[PDB]
Amino acid sequence: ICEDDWNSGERFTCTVTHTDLPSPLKQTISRPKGVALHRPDVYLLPPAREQLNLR
Amino acid sequence: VSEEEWNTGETYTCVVAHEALPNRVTERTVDKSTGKPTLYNVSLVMSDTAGTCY
Numbered sequence: 001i002c003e004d005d006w007n008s009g010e011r012f013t014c015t016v017t018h019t020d021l022p023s024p025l026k027q028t029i030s031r032p033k034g035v036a037l038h039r040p041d042v043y044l045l046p047p048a049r050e051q052l053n054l055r
Numbered sequence: 056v057s058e059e060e061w062n063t064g065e066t067y068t069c070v071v072a073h074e075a076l077p078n079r080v081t082e083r084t085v086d087k088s089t090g091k092p093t094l095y096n097v098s099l100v101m102s103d104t105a106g107t108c109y
């Protein structure tokens with residue numbers, strides 16, 4: 001399925017019908033909209049000169 | 056002293072003796088290594104390696 005469709009929160013559930021438990025069980029998978037979206041600020045710090053000096 | 060003897064690296068000391076001395080005797084020495092130098096190739100290296108000497 002599309003990434004964006006899942007991001008919309010389709011809440012897929014794999015319906016399972018079993019003899020011991022007549023009632024089908026639902027297990028939703030979706031993205032909670034409450035969580036914010038802040039872009040990472042990725043920083044790449046080179047090796048400390050104290051590492052290179054030790055060589 | 057001989058000219059060629061001084062040319063090689065043989066050091067001398069002119070130990071003098073004076074009353075007004077702590078040890079009562081003063082020793083001072085020289086050699087060609089102590090003479091006037093000509094060349095000075097100071098390397099004066101500059102390195103980020105700071106803590107360790109050399």
Ligand SMILES: *[C@@H]1O[C@H](CO)[C@@H](O)[C@H](O)[C@H]1NC(C)=O
Pocket residue numbers: 096097098
């Ligand atoms: C000093 O001069 C000599 C030539 O007389 C040279 O071979 C040497 O590299 C010089 N020292 C330096 C550049 O540190």
Ligand SMILES: *[C@@H]1O[C@H](CO)[C@@H](O)[C@H](O)[C@H]1NC(C)=O
Pocket residue numbers: 096098
């Ligand atoms: C300085 O000059 C001499 C040449 O008499 C040379 O052998 C020596 O390597 C030089 N110093 C350095 C740090 O290279």
